[PDB]
Amino acid sequence: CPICRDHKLHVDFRNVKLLEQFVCAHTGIIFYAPYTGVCVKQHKRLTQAIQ
């Protein structure tokens, strides 16, 4: 998936520029996993880091 294919992308609550890519800029909702194709493991880590 997009996160797992690049080991330098780190899902962390401080890397806000990466987290913004998984939130809708117009609605602020977090994309569901099929939207971006991230695995369930990384989508949970993204949702926790975003929060």
Partner 1 sequence: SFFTKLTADELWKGALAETGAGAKKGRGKRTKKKKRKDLNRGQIIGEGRYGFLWPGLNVPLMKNGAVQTIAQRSKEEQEKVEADMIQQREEWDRKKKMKVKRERGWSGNSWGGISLGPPDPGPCGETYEDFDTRILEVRNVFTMTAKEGRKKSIRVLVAVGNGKGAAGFSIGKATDRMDAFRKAKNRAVHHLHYIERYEDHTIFHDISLRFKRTHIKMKKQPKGYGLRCHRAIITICRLIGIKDMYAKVSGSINMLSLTQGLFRGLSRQETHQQLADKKGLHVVEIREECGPLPIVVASPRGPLRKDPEPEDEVPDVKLDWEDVKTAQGMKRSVWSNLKRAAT
Residues at the contact surface with Zn ion, assessed by CB under 5 A: 1, 4, 39, 42
Shortest spacing between CB 6 and Zn ion, in angstroms: 10
Look at residue 48 and give its three-state secondary structure.
Answer: helix
Task: Quickly count helices (H) and strands (E) in the chain.
Answer: 3, 0
For residue 7, give the amino acid letter: H
Shortest spacing between CB 45 and partner 1, in angstroms: 19
Shortest spacing between CB 31 and partner 1, in angstroms: 8
Chain contacts with partner 1 (rule: CB under 8 A): 24-27, 31-37
